[PDB]
Amino acid sequence: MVKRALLSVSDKTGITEFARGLEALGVKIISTGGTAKILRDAGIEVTDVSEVTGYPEMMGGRVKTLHPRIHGGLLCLRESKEQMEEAEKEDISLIDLVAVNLYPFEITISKEGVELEEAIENIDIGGPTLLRSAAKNYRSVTVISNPSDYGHVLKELRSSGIISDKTRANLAVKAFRHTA
Amino acid sequence: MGRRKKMVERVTTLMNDPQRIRNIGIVAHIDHGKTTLSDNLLAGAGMISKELAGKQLFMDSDEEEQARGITIDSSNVSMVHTFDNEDYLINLIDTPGHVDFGGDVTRAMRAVDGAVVVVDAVEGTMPQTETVLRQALREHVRPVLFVNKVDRLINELQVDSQEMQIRLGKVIDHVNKLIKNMNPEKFKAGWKVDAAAGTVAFGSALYNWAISVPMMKKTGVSFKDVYDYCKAGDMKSLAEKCPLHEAVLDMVIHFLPNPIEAQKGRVKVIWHGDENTEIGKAMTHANAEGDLAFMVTDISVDPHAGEVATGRLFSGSLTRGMEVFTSGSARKSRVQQVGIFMGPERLEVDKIPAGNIAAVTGLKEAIVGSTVTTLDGMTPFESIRHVSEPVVTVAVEAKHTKDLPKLIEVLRQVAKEDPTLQITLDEETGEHLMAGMGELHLEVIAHRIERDKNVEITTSKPIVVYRETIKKKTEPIEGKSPNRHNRFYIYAEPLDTEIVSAIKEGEVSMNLPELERRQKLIDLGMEKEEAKGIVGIFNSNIFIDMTKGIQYLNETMELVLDGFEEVMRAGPLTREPVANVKCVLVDAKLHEDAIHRGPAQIIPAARQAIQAGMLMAEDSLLEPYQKVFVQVPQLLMGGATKELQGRRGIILNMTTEGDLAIIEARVPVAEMFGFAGEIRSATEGRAMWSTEFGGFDVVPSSILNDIVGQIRERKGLKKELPKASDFLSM
Amino acid sequence: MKGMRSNIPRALNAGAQIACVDNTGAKVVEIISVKKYRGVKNRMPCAGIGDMCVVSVKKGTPEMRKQVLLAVVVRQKQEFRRPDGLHVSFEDNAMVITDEEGIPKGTDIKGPVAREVAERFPKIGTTASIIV
Amino acid sequence: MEQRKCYFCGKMLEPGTGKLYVKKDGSTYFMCSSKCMSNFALGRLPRRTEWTEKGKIQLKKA
RNA sequence: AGGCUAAGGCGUGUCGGAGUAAUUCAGUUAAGGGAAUUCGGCAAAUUAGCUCCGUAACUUCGGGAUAAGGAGUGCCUGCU
RNA sequence: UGCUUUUAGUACGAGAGGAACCAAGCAGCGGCGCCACUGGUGUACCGGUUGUCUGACAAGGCAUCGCCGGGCAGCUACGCGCUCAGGAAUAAGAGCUGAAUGCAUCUAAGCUCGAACUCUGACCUAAAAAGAGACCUCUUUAAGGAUUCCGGUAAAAGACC
């Protein structure tokens, strides 16, 4: 089913519960950066992204990773040769659930003149990739950009068992839209 | 049953044979013949198939000493000499006593039973010699005298036999006269040497010949006969008749102590923990069954077998496998392979009991200053620590424009070359701000550059790296986000020095179980509430979230701690890293959604607030000090002491050991400039000085504004004091 | 199998969820049945130190979970007597994944193993860091 | 014949009797009796328990 | 409330008894395992007061809620 | 009644694969007994402590043994000891001799082997075995038995020792 969870949600709302819920059904939580801490403190066991994509991470808070044949795993069809291939490789994981929202962009005019520098240097680059990747998976992998629908997902999983096409679809569409 | 294999078994027998061990060493002045003696000793007793050594400098098992002709640092080898029909394991402590060494000297000396003072037959007792001898003796390491290079006198300077022994006598004299001024109590316990007592040999390492009063008689070979062979090209005969290893190993065993005995007085002098304690009695009177004592003194990182830490098995049998600890860094690592040292290589053996330097792999808690133990919180021979960071930086430039590339790579290597600096390798200006640990260290490295690589470059005025510090407890300052939808009422106050120290110690971490960390802090001083409400530690700064029941703060956290770390990296005043600063968050008005809580809004507010607070709490600077140790003559103390006093020399000890006024003080790093020169200049060239990071200290308020202004200028800042007023804007 | 020197009470019966203490990716395995054990009416399958059980991986990696595997118990809290009259007990129960022959699927075993299993299956002993 | 000392009371384990207790970290403790085992498992320390040799040593330290 | 005591009311409704076996009504405790028992966790066990922190999906916006999940708690000395 | 070692990587087989007699240990279940060891219980006993009463201390009552910790004896298992056979006569079956039926034939007589079966044999019970037993000792107003007394290796009453 859905047994891995890469949740690097910029906005740290709902992740607490979501993560517990997951941990309960199983679903190894492979988050990093902010999320990691918050969860490994609330109690939810979380594994750091470090041991998945070949090389670790950097400047937590936005950057993190950006690995080709790891985003290509989740991407689309994690069970169809060519595509799936990028979710296995060398310890490379076949993560099936992703939720990474993007803190909205802002300019925040500083008292001493517009903080253009910082502004530009806080445009999430990592996020949009992971997101659009997972999103791409109208099939297999499920992406949940929006934080305000953790319920629906959890609900379905808990009850039904596996996620539903209908849902996967909406989720993806929404995620792409969000990156837009 | 190869000769080597039979020796190997012998090796093991001797290992579990502490009474038949001799952990000896070699102590001498530069270019006296250390490496020479060493390697030719190895080959002298033929422990290995001769050829093996020589060409591949064995004793020099590392890579630096391997091109010198005189020993430089530590490691060890082994000899097994047959004396009156009896073999004895002779560990050969490599000597890290070259003047270019401080703590290392001590470290090895605290693993050397005794040594061999090697005095050039011509140049005689030398400054270096004096230093090493006195040191070693201080740490209770009985030596013997092997006047090497007699060959020179005999031939080169065509001296006659009678004169030969007149000169050597005068040396013997000098030797003891010093020993006397070093420790009269030990000179009363008869450690002093004399060739008639077999504790002094005579020979030439480079020619492998060597004699000594006893052997002399035994064989019939007299000083005059020696002179005859030397003058008549019979040094080959000499060598054969009276081997070098022969005489040396005789001194090394017949008059030099074994683990057991050595350990006794050694523990009594060096160690300070109550000898009634088990560990104590264990390592005093030969016992390896007790608490593990394995002070790693070397890390032979075998490229094809991992980190192989080499320490003397003062206590602690080495049965295959053992989860243990260490001194200071007493964490929870194990102990896998424990090879002993045969020849210069690592012969893998099982259980090693007492006085037998062993190399252990799979040891995370194992470096210099760490005495690997199986009894947590092990008492200290000589207190040690582990922290050391760049405090004195210089702006290495490249005058010669046709050198930049070379420079770039040379300092790109300098990193591991000497892991004590942190060059800010840049392209914007080309000025590589090399951050060293000490003005002298800097000077040394810089010199090494245009010497071993020879880049036609220099270095500009060294500058001290300060820390920014607050003075009092502040009043809640509101940090407002641009959009005003977030307000962060926060205050700060000085960080408790105790907590400071322990955080720099590393034990207190943010990766620590609540209970664990909390407790430590709680007793250290941190009021329970705060200890329970901490959420981050940066160098010597903490952000104690002391608020309760604030919606969305749980998540929010990150952005605020970001601002926190930013401001802490460069304080609002002197733009220096903050240190000894603890913040307490008191209120967190937040907007409901995250739209109006995006990092671009949070980060500013926090930053703004913290900075404003710091400035309102009389921001000062911390100046590092640098514990001085001046190994100088007794007599010499007038100008010396007055000098340090004029340089704020807090004397913490003066050790006026007989004819030596070894003053131990503490002087501010910034004021250490020039001291190098003046000390010796005034003391007629008689001042072996050495220093070490004396800890940051609240800069004397005296001329704080002055120091501040200087920094401001140098780092090109504004002349209006960065008034908190503005930071805490509308 | 080869006889052990000690007398081992079969302490763990079917349904027990035991911590798995090797690096195979199985954290908790539930005992399903005991190999080479014939029971009697109403008696649950019983296993002590040195016994091989069929287990189901309840926690751990997704590859380990839901798999029917073979495991060997290496630690048990129920006290067992050595031939010389001394009674030995561990602080917890612990098992390691193996094959039919007794070879461990893992490479290192965290924690002490019993000398009985260390001798009955020599490869478990070599894989284990310390044998008590 | 291995001569063993009770970890709690410090008494010699008589042959054919007594227990060996092993913790997860490989630490081994000889117990002469169920009393000593129970007191060890309660978290009580021998140095604070007066009837044991470690308690007696702690008291005679004064 | 429950427990221990006043006042007041009572010992008022078959005895004795040597292991007083087995069995049975009602209880206490129980190694290791922990629902494998059973139609079914029936029965039993767990938790439990008060203070503080923290509290999800969903919602008819009232709630869910003591949700969940954490920390403290005795005595003595001196006090605000 | 199984597993493992050995036989044996042998016979067999081109290989792959792969036995049997004998021997040893262990294990599962069953049976019988036992309590040195280990575990449980242990309302004998010892301690800590909550609430309350006896004026306080001390010493005591009550609250499930108030609760909590420990525990000797005893009992107990989750602990411990012991628990092959051999022989006879047979079933299926394999043979010997052997005619009817010159030969042949395990069969019609006769004969030898042949099972976890049956019997015997190492266990328990058994003079109320109506054929109601054998032997020895003691003594015939005795031997000896019971009752009373102090008990427990025994015991529901009896009985038993």
- CA of residue C85 to C1' of nucleotide F33, angstroms: 22
State the angle between helix axes of B599-616 and B553-569 in degrees (0 to 180), rounded to the nearest 10: 50
Q: List, as residue ranges, the binding site of D.
A: 6, 9, 32, 36
What is the DSSP track for B164-202? HHHHHHHHHHHHHHHHHHH-HHHHHTT----GGGT-EEE
d(CA B531, CA B538): 15
User: Which residues of D fall within a CB distance of 8 Å from C86?
Assistant: 2, 4, 13, 16-20
Closest among B724, B639, B633, B629 to B672, alpha carbons compared: B629
Which strand (E) or helix (H) includes residue B203? Answer: strand B200-204
The owner of tokens 């997860």 is: D24
* A98 and A131 Cβ atoms separated by less than 8 Å: yes
Asked if C85 CB < 7 A from strand F, the reply is: yes
Tokens at B420, concatenated: 């004590």
CA distance B325 to B317: 14
Question: Tokens in use for A18?
Answer: 């979501």
Task: Identify the bridge partners of residue B395 per DSSP, sorted by sequence position.
Answer: B433
Residue C81 CB in 7 A reach of strand F: yes
Which of B595, B483, B591 is closest to A147 using CA atoms? B595
In this complex, the answer to whether residue C41 has its CB under 7 A from any atom of chain F, a nucleic strand, is no
Do B318 and B350 touch, CB atoms closer than 8 A?
yes
Cα–Cα dist C20/C26, whole Å:
6
Residues 6+ apart with CB under 8 A from A105: A119, A122, A123, B598, B600
Q: Which two tokens stand for residue B99?
A: 């003047």
Distance of CA C28 to the CA centre of its chain: 12
Of B278, B237, B255, B238, nearest in space to B198 by CA: B255
Amino acid identity of B6?
A: K
Nearest 5 degrees, angle CA B530-CA B532-CA B536? 80
Give C12 CA → E21 C1' in Å. 37
* Residues from chain A contacting residue C62 (CB–CB below 8 Å): 3-4, 26, 28
Q: What's the CA gap between B683 and B54, in Å, rounded?
A: 43
H helix or E strand, kind and range, residue C31:
strand C26-34
Of A12, A38, A103, the CB nearest to B598: A103
Q: Which of B423, B428, B420 is nearest to B412 (CA)?
A: B423
The H or E element containing residue C73 is: strand C68-75
Q: Is the CB of C15 under 7 A from strand F?
A: no
Q: What are phi and psi of B6, to 5 degrees?
A: -60, -40
Q: Tell me what percent of chain A is helix, strand and coil, each rounded to the nearest 5.
A: 45, 5, 50
Tokens of C72: 């060997």
Alpha helices, DSSP H, located in chain A: 15-25, 33-42, 68-75, 81-84, 116-120, 126-135, 150-158, 165-179
Q: Which 3 state secondary structure label does DSSP give B725?
A: helix
Per-residue exposure over A55-72, b if at least 16 CB sit within 10 Å of its own CB, e if not: eebeebbbebbbbebbbb
Helix (H, G, I), strand (E, B) or coil at B58: coil
d(CA A129, CA B314): 58
Nucleotide nearest to C41 (CA to C1'): F29
* CA distance linking residue A86 with residue A78, whole number of Å: 8
A109/B554 CB distance under 8 A? no
Gap from D25 CA to chain C (nearest CA, Å): 6
Query: Residue A148: closest CA among chain B residues belongs to which residue?
Result: B593
Give Cα B567 to chain centroid, integer Å. Answer: 33
CB atoms near residue B253 (< 10 Å): 22
Enumerate chain A positions whose Cβ falls within 8 A of a Cβ in B: 11-13, 15-16, 34, 37-38, 61, 103-111, 115, 118-119, 122
Report the C-alpha gap between C46 and C53 in whole angstroms: 9
Counting every residue, how long is chain C?
A: 132
As a whole number of angstroms, the distance between CA B537 and CA B518 comes to 13
DSSP state of B360: E
As ranges, strand F nucleotides with an atom below 7 A of a protein CB are 2-5, 25-30, 36-40, 69-72, 78-81
Looking at the complex, report in whole angstroms how far the Cα of residue B357 sits from the nearest Cα belonging to chain A. 38
Which residues, in sequence order, are CB contacts of C69 under 8 Å at separation 6+? Answer: C26, C29, C54, C55, C56, C57, C97, C105
CA separation for the pair B329, B310 (Å, rounded): 17
Chain B contact residues (CB < 8 Å to C): 321, 334
* Diameter over CA atoms, chain B: 101
Q: Do B482 and A11 touch (CB under 8 A)?
A: no
List all residues 6 or more positions away from D36 whose beta carbon is below 8 Å from its beta carbon. D6, D7, D8, D9
| Gap from C104 CA to F111 C1', Å | 64
Tokens of B619: 């921001």
**Torsion, Cα of B441, B446, B450, B456 (10° steps):** -170
Q: Tell me how far apart the alpha carbons of residues D30 and C86 are, in angstroms, rounded to a whole number.
A: 10
Which among B483, B562, B599 is the nearest to A103, CB-wise? Answer: B599
Question: Of chain C residues 93-132, which have a beta carbon within 7 Å of strand F?
Answer: none
**What is the Rg, in whole angstroms, of the alpha carbon atoms belonging to chain B?**
30
CB B21 within 8 A of CB B356: yes
Listed residue (B611, B601, B624) closest to B672, CA to CA: B624
Would you state the structure tokens that stand for residue B480, as one six-digit string?
A: 């407002």
- The b-or-e profile of B315-351 (16+ CB within 10 A means b, else e) is bbbbeeebebbbbbbbeebebebbbbbbbbebbebee
Residues 102-131 of C with CB under 8 A from B: 129-130
Owner of token pair 């990696």: C61
Rounded to 5 degrees, φ, ψ at A8 are: -105, 35
β-pair type (B663-668, B620-631) = antiparallel
Residues of chain D contacting C90 with CB distance shorter than 8 Å: 21-23
| Residue A42 neighbours by CB distance under 10 Å | 14
Method of determination used here: cryo-EM
Angstrom CA distances, B428 to B271, B395, B413, C102, C105, stand at: 52, 13, 21, 65, 56
Instruction: Work out the burial of residue B395: count CB atoms within 10 Å of its CB; fewer than 13 is exposed, 13-18 middle, 19 or more buried.
Output: middle
CB-based contact B295:B107 (threshold 8 Å): yes
- CA of C111: which chain B residue's CA is closest? B323
- Nearby residues of B386 by Cβ (< 8 Å), 6 or more positions away: B328, B329, B369, B505, B506
Contact B88, B11 (CB under 8 A): no
B556's enclosing H/E stretch is helix B553-569
Would you give the end-to-end CA distance of chain A in angstroms? 29
The Cα angle at residue B38 between residues B36 and B40, in degrees rounded to 5 = 65
Nominal resolution in Å?
3.5
Q: Are D41 and D47 in contact (CB under 8 A)?
A: no
> Which amino acid belongs to residue B601?
Q
Q: Determine the Cα–Cα distance for residues B136 and B97; give it in Å rounded to an integer.
A: 9
- Nearest Cα to B463, choosing from B531, B390, B411? B390
Contact C59 A3 (CB under 8 A): no
Distance from CA of C132 to the nearest CA of B (A): 13
Distances (CA, A) of B374 to A178, B266, B282, B326, B673: 57, 21, 13, 7, 44
Q: Return the residue of A nearest to B556 by Cα.
A: A12
Do B330 and B294 touch, CB atoms closer than 8 A? no
Contact B695, B656 (CB under 8 A): no
Question: Quick one: DSSP state of residue B146?
Answer: E
Closest among B195, B185, B199 to B222, alpha carbons compared: B195
The answer to whether the annotation marks B151 as part of a ligand binding site is yes
- The span from the CA of A7 to the CA of A47, in Å, is 11
Residue D3 (CA) to nucleotide F47 (C1'), in angstroms, measures 32
Shortest Cα distance, chain B CAs vs residue C110, angstroms: 12
- The set of chains that have 3 or more CB pairs under 8 A with D is C
A3 touches chain C (CB under 8 A): yes
Torsion of CA B557, B563, B567, B570, to 10 degrees: 120
CA of D38 to C1' of F76 (A): 21
Rounded distance, CA B56 to CA B63, Å?
A: 11
DSSP per residue, B377-441: S---SS---------EEEEEB--STT-HHHHHHHHHHHHHHSTT---B--SSS--EEEEESSHHH
> Is residue A30 a contact partner of residue A49, using CB atoms and an 8 Å limit?
yes
How many Cβ atoms sit within 10 Å of the Cβ of residue C13? 13
Q: Do chains D and A touch (3 or more CB pairs under 8 A)?
A: no
Sign of torsion over alpha carbons B247, B248, B252, B256: positive
CA of A149 to C1' of F33 (A): 71
Nucleotide nearest to C36 (CA to C1'): F3
End-to-end Cα, chain C, rounded Å = 21
Residue given tokens 């840049």 in the structure block: B426
Sort out which chain C residues have CB atoms less than 8 A from D16's CB and list them. Answer: 84-86
Query: Which of B393, B397, B395 lies closest to B464, judged by CA?
Result: B393
Residues of each annotated binding site of D for Zn(2+): 6, 9, 32, 36
Q: Are C28 and C20 in contact (CB under 8 A)?
A: yes
Taking CB atoms and an 8 Å limit, are C65 and A4 in contact across chains? Answer: no
Q: Which residues are bridge partners to B697 per DSSP?
A: B623
The residue type at B613 = G
Q: State whether residue D26 sits within 8 Å of chain C by CB.
A: yes
CB B579 within 8 A of CB B469: yes
Q: Is the CB of C10 under 7 A from strand F?
A: yes
Chain A contacts of B483, Cβ < 8 Å?
108
